[PDB]
Amino acid sequence: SLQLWQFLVALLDDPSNSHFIAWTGRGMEFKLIEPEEVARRWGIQKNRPAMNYDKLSRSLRYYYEKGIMQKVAGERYVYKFVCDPEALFSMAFSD
DNA sequence: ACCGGAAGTG
DNA sequence: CACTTCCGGT
């Protein structure tokens, strides 16, 4: 019963996943080094074996409207977590 | 690579 | 709600 942003926060945390997903170090900026593996892993997690990066990125793109995160434009596969009071309350509650 | 729209699924 | 699917479009 995991949300995508929560699933990524978990993978991102340990450096055992440094080869496919990691923090840029420029704040909450994070890049999906190997997007199809991040996609593969999200798929096994939700038992959606059809998961690829085009589907996973739509769900990340839905996070733009939620205020939780936004694209780090100009840097391929790099996204960032929005650090504002609206996003803190969006992440400290679910339906 | 990256962006929605729109329908559909738990 | 929170995605998933699956396009069309730039």
Residue numbers in the entry: 334 to 428
Quote the authors verbatim.
The Ets transcription factor family consists of 28 genes in humans containing the evolutionarily conserved 85 amino acid Ets DNA-binding domain, originally identified as a viral oncogene (E26 transformation-specific). The Ets domain is a variant helix-turn-helix (winged helix) structure, comprising three α-helices and a four-stranded antiparallel β-sheet. Here, we present the crystal structures of the Ets domains of the entire PEA3 subfamily (Etv1, Etv4, and Etv5) together with the structure of the Erg family member (Fev). Furthermore, a new Ets dimerization interface linked by a redox-sensitive disulfide bond is identified, and this dimerization is shown to result in a significant inhibition of DNA binding, potentially linking Ets transcription factors with cellular redox regulatory mechanisms.
In all four DNA complexes, the recognition helix (α3) inserts deep into the major groove and provides multiple contacts with the base pairs of the core GGAA sequence, as well as with the phosphate backbone. Specifically in Etv1, hydrogen bonds to phosphate oxygens are formed with the side chains of residues Gln-336, Trp-375, Tyr-386, Ser-392, and Tyr-396, whereas salt bridges are formed with Lys-379, Lys-388, Lys-399, and Lys-404. Two additional charged residues, Arg-381 and Arg-409, appear to be in position with the potential to interact with the phosphodiester backbone; the former occupies a position between the two DNA strands in the region of the minor groove narrowing, and the latter could potentially form an additional salt bridge in longer DNA sequences. In both cases, the overall structure is very well conserved (root mean square deviation of ∼1 Å), with only minor movements of both the N and C termini and the β3-β4 loop, which appear to move away from the DNA in the DNA complexes of both Etv1 and Fev, avoiding potential steric overlaps that can be seen to occur following structural superposition. On an individual residue level, the most striking transitions can be seen to occur in the recognition helix α3, where in Etv1 Asp-387, Arg-391, and Arg-394 can be seen to become ordered upon DNA binding and Tyr-395, which can be seen to switch between the two alternative rotamers found to be important for recognition of bases downstream of the GGA motif in the Fev-DNA complex. Somewhat surprisingly, mutants in residues involved in salt bridges to the DNA backbone (Lys-379 and Lys-404) exhibited no detectable DNA binding. Overall, the mutational analysis demonstrates that the residues interacting with the DNA backbone in the crystal structure are the major contributors to the binding affinity in solution, although the interactions with the bases add a significant but lower energetic contribution. We were able to reproduce the inhibition of DNA binding by specific phosphorylation of Ser-334, a known PKA target site, in the isolated Ets domain in vitro.
